[model samples]
Target: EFPVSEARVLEDRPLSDKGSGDSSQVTQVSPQRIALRLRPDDSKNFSIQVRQVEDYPVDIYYLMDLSYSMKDDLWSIQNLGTKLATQMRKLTSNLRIGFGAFVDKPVSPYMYISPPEALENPCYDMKTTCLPMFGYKHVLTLTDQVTRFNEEVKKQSVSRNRDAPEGGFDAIMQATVCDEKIGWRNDASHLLVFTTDAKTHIALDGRLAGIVQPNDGQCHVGSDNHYSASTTMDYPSLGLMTEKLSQKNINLIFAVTENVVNLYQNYSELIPGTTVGVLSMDSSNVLQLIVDAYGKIRSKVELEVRDLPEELSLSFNATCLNNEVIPGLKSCMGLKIGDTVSFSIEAKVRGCPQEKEKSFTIKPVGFKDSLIVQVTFDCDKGEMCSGHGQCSCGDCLCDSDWTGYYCNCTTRTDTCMSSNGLLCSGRGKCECGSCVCIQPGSYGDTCEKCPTCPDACTFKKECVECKKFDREPYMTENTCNRYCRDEIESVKELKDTGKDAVNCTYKNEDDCVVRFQYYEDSSGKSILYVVEEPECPKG
Candidate 1:
């Protein structure tokens, strides 16, 4: 009874089993990289599990701000389309590029619509036949055709906005969520570069134009290549914008003028895989800045968590290459190419949530592939421990008389104890109502019996050990001395009966002769006896 999100596999090239090198080495396994969405139910607890592997294909989207201030920046970017593609080839061989542009919402206050032509062309003074100011526009789909990208950038004209703040957030929101229009690929690194020199209007700024509906975090572009909800929806909030951007796996780079560099930098920190740089008025360093930012984002790894239940707390520990452990850290920096970082996230629910199951998301910063978690609330009063123990997350704190994950196991020590009441044969430990013997010689239900050995007394082995080992003279005396004494006295007292026990011990002085016989019975008893001499018949 859970709403499961389908995961999309992006780049799934598993290491092959037929490769040269270590034949037994693990090459590839399931789940190389994927993407999915997790929607929480009434419960707010969920787990985001991800396995990071690899990538080479890359997708770059050019989301330029067509505001009047970027006229010169646009000129520089138009000339570099060919050069930019050439330089990007060094980073990855398989690259695809797309172009999109934005200025401001086509509303009165956001843009001047009085001149009639102003409504259609904000750059009337500088150029003719201009596209109207809108939240976003899909100029080109992703392609390897560098010439088409150059042509589109050159044909683009700047748009004028009444306020210094452009509808940059609106444009970014549309670009991120508009999956079909952007033509994003699951098997690639996505990079979205926005060039501008002005601050952006976030959610609620649309009130100036009587636009109150919030951006719905969905694609609204139509066949006309325009944001259908541009005039209908208000600007999206910073939080909503960041979430949408991360979900689409877009790495945003803000190439802006020095004047607003700090503003964009702060905004970049708010979103993962985002970076900002200074744009020469001529946009001279735009290409280099993008390349540098790409390098930086690709080499670093960061962990992100979202939609966690209020009562539940989440913590993360990361392990990077060379066995470096970052304790309580949110990200890993300076990772080498082909290196892997592991994250251990522990989510603890202090109490139950309003819903029975909650959903959440986890992923590396800058990568669209993520782990969506749906956690069931198994901590209710009588639901945990199978009604027999206290529930703590997935573990049951069993009661004194019960044990196991749900306290289903009954606590009994009798099964582990021997007949003599010794546990693990007194040589090992007791576990789960059973005795586990210590080693090769000690075993049995209670660990009370020793292993059988050759040439040793059957059941009464103590006396046999005392006789075999010479370390204890007292042992031999204490065990066999009594038997020797009884046998000697018996032999001396009885006359030689032909079928009587062999009398081997003798008492003599001077020339006296004595004979003794040593024997043991099957019941582990030692018999010692003294015998008289063979008489004078042999002499």
Candidate 2:
């Protein structure tokens, strides 16, 4: 496994209770880790199995309707901290519980918006010190400390609303959606327990308050931890509610009183993976009801997946132990505590991805743990591909006129670039691989430099002066051409010094301006360009 016999199991941790530290037991999931040295367009078939770890973590958010009528339920819930945490510890290795409180939308028809006294303190009965009518207030984030849950719940107080149908939709929607603010864990079974005594408002009712805007379906909660959207935005639509809940992998448990138990049961039918529990007297039965619901939810295990590379073709197939019907390529059901399920994970890399390490994950529905598959292309050429060719997809692409393993064979062609496209910078000729300079002072990798050669300015200055002016000591045209190599090309004025070849300016005998530029073609022949008008001094 160390040297990677092409494939080996990287991680095979046995299913154990969280914190068990015992990997010696039978492993259902073959490997939670994978990395293979796969070449381009090749794939390996592997078996992956699933067994939910006993210590699988869970998160429970208790959402309460804080309308005045539900006073007894709140008291029962406040005292539930120890009993609930103890019951949950038997099933979950890591347990986190939080609270979110709800009331009617603090606006016109939903609230009595008249006097400052009523608006500020909504309890007309003066039973106790009541908090203002709030749409939703996030009381506590998921906490590991059970004592804190009890501490925070004691601080909660009931508020007055005009309608028995509370704005549970507005309040509960924010709790479920603002995952980060409520501190939902990625790797935990998340349960939003909606504890209320009555049937509540649905989406369209919010239009009564001039809130025509559709629910934006985003967390409007701030550091203040309140549902700031209720007054300005309409209640969340059923579609948005359904979409957001499933996307976040949260299971909704409606723990309502008997009067509305059937009402939410119908809702539970509409929403997939939801459970409804009827409350007795003061929701004192909530403790046992949750464990029962979780038992049913756990036994029927289903799997889901996140994204993988589009270029890859991956399919999942499951074979359950019994009449666990997911009969299509399909998912399975009916799992026991010790037993596990498996998947024949098949993948074919249709196209070669760029040089990168790839990874993706698959997990059970509502469960936190996942199976991660790592993929990468086998394109490693360690030392050198004959120092001539580049390695692409484990194959060598040889240089010009060179072909064969690692570009070792000689094909008698020179492909290195030389100045001016010359065979060797116009000062040398080339063999198959390297060049041999024919002219003195030419020395570079490709005859690219010749510092010892006479400057183009030295000879060409004299060459241009005699050619342009008919002086007594005139250098003949034959002499000029033979010595300077190329005749002058006269232009009105010199452009900026971007002419690639050598260009130089000189002050001559009578302070006359003589400017020339030199160029050479591939054959070592040169050409000259000069200013059309000669500059003569007035003095």
Candidate 3:
């Protein structure tokens, strides 16, 4: 015999003749819902979700200036490559290094061009052979093993040129664009170290080079004094290169001769997640420099951008500090042990093109220590709905499909309008800042439809025969009141037919809106409301 009570688990173990339970009788009655776990063993009134550290792959493309000025840097770079492998051993096991070199353009008559005789080796007169002035070369793909890097660096014969400034900007462009061509490891942390002693040609400087076209975001491969000419012929700016490099999850480090460290530093702010260091001509303590730079770039801020803001441009001011102050290195820079510096990611609001909220990381400078910060912008511009349909908070409203300032999307056409690879289901249209469920009967963030009614719903013993209804009804404030009154009426009718005595009454201004019934018992009177809500509509 089963004892009646609220539904709960009832083991099926059979009673044995000797008073011990039998195995055949054990049957699970009710499946228990998994308990919400807050921690290893503690549970609070609410459950908490934990977040894990996010790790990204790194791609480092080394752009060495092989102009006549860097003859010393060129010969010394081969040895530096071998030492770098050992330096980054502990930082990351998945390190990939690519190789490339740049020289000033011969197209510009503004700079002295090598005579036909000087083309063989413009710096031969200075006692050493130099690479010729040209564009760039994607020499090798990123790799962990240093032997390969050493071999390739050895093959890079010094080129000759008369220009003091090399095509540094042009080479930087090639390093970031030839992503597929260089076979950069996508799984490791990326770092690009531009090592040279000279300045670089800026935009419009190459007008004499016949490269009047601006550097577009396309990947251009430079060959024997020739470039891919088209509407897409463009070079990478310090800012553009940094942006592309950051997009690839790569960090850039500028290592120049001590004489030019400040010169490199002047441009460091232009390259987010990039740093600069000074090295001696003999390359003393260069390995340490690489290690320090690797740690610093990885320890900076996380960056985010609104896809297409109405009008947006940003500039940042940042600095790095170390655990211990060095003798010659800037002491005030870098964060102190267990300290965080300020970071201001300022954007000029030309227009609202971003989604609701955007978050980015600030990477630290050293691996042993963690020094980073993250800032999030809740598009409080009253446009993006903070990636949610409702905008109770001051933010650009948005649905789950979009995120960031103006409802920038995670997927959909890169333009955030069309199908960004099914980011927004075809049934819905991306609205002001969220997905508009264009399909009738489809709702929710993803436009999923409602479910059909169940075959039957059973409460205790026999409260009512729910299937007796002719049509599915929907619940409203008024409909629900009617439903509850009907249930009470039905119960009262059964009591009267059974010759049972019972008292019933309707309360509240809406008399029939609320009804109650009571049965007298020896100890007291028990009352219950026959409240039942109307059924919901099927999709």
Candidate 4:
């Protein structure tokens, strides 16, 4: 028995069937759980499956930087919620939206917490009572009520931070982990719209505020619906943020302004499922941004690896409807709503990892659902495959001259022999018992036959005349094989003449006569014809 067990297609469906736009239907992945017994060798085979569907439920969470500079952008989108919903509806009728706001962590360097007035309102220039600087607040959970969405956005007053970078990274982390508070639906395509005009803090930046405790990547939103652990926790690391984002099936779209567009653009790669779009002057185009971002996310599907064990790596070859494998291809393109497609997938081990029974996850970039694969590295496997090839995972990696389940069958066999008792009639090589003739004139089974090569009529004329009339130029059998490769006949008249035939007549030294015509036939065979008798002779 092989080290890897027989895989089962736990979920079965044709790749070409479209979703009925079923709001209730979830485009589920198969073998939510799978197991593989691994070998430390070059190869193994398996697949992860995701069904294609249309009008998949979508949950878009709008995360905004509520710093004073964005006060205008925030106001622009307050009533634009209805317009945003309309455009997203073109993408999916079953869509829900939530809103959340973030500023800097309420600590010095980020703000002047030493001053009582600046603690509540960091706007020293403007004599106003701005909202108290908070880390992140859940303004509204997901709901179809665009009316309530606008009201919440209206209620969120601007805050100020000392630094140009807001605590947006912290906002993103909390927005994803606080799934229940954000009302994220598992049956939906989750799109997190992070809009900010400034840069964000990363892994170790939290030390600036003496917040040494790392973010535990859990919901700390308290009874007041505000991120309670902001001061106590460090901003989540990029790795932890990516993990939580993948776990929650949230795709991120950064709606940012001109200055920090390139900043987030570069950081986008660390998070697999993310896109960036430059925000318009006033965020008036937020509607178009949402729909366009959704279109980009929906049109392509890229699978990602989660928690891949050390010493293990992966490679995938996707064979879409085009039926050609694009090596290392985990992404599919040119897809439309409800269009069903399929893909191919794989993995290899680099070295012996410490954990024998480890696992990894295969996930579509923008969706949270994934295929979970459990790996078992076994010591009891493969016995050199009958000594002719390397045995791996219960299969033979054969050498060129041998093949079979055990690699014991020699490739040298008589199947390449023809009636002439020669392999490929001694003109070409035989492969796997079949004639693989690559020569221009060698063809057919065992390369025993070919279309007759065109021969010069005048050159072959003497051979026919010598053999037929018994003259001094008489042809030998060996000479004839070269001189006249095709059979010749003398007839009363050339009745069956080929279109390329040339007429000819020969006068012998003693006035004897021979008349003939020759041509290449349709099948490239040389055709020759001659008159039945000599008209004159002087013997």
TM-score winner: 4
- TM-score on alpha carbons, each prediction: 0.58, 0.58, 0.47, 0.64
Query: Mind giving the per-residue lDDT tens digits that candidate 1 earns over 97-196?
Result: 8899888888878777667644565456665445566668789988888778889888887666678888878878878888787888775678888888
lDDT of 2 at 312: 55
lDDT preference between candidates 1 and 4, better one: 4
Q: Tens-digit lDDT track for model 3 on 1-539?
A: 22211121222221222111133321111111112111111112211111111222345667776655555655666786667766665444446677877665544352345455655435556666555545665677777666788788878776665666666777666666666776655334456777777777777666656666777756666543233432134345566666666555555677778677777766875564467777657544456767767555533333233242223333333322222211111112222112333333333332234354332222222121111111222233354434453322454633333334654543332232222123234456544335676665565554444243111122111222222222223232222321322222334322332223333333332222322333333212232333343223345
lDDT of each: 0.62, 0.68, 0.45, 0.69
- What overall lDDT, based on C-alpha atoms, would model 3 receive against the true structure? 0.45
* lDDT top scorer: 4
TM-score of 4: 0.64
* Model 3's TM-score against the true structure: 0.47
Which sections of candidate 4 miss by over 4 Å? 1-5, 12-25, 28-44, 47-52, 116-124, 307-315, 346-360, 373-539
At residue 15, what lDDT does model 2 achieve?
A: 62
lDDT of 2 at 444: 83
> How many residue pairs clash in model 2?
1
Writing each residue's lDDT as its tens digit, candidate 4 over 1-539 gives 34544254344342233333333245445445666666655446677666546656678888888888877887788887787777777667677889998887888777656666545554766776477788788888999897788888878788777787788888898888888889888677888998888888887798978888998998888878888888888888888988888778788898888777778876875665577887866888676777777766776666767787755556566654435443434666445555444455555554445555587778777665567777766545645435444333344555433445665544553566565333476567766567678675768878877666434455656766665755545343324332334567877654454556776777765576667777663213465677777678454
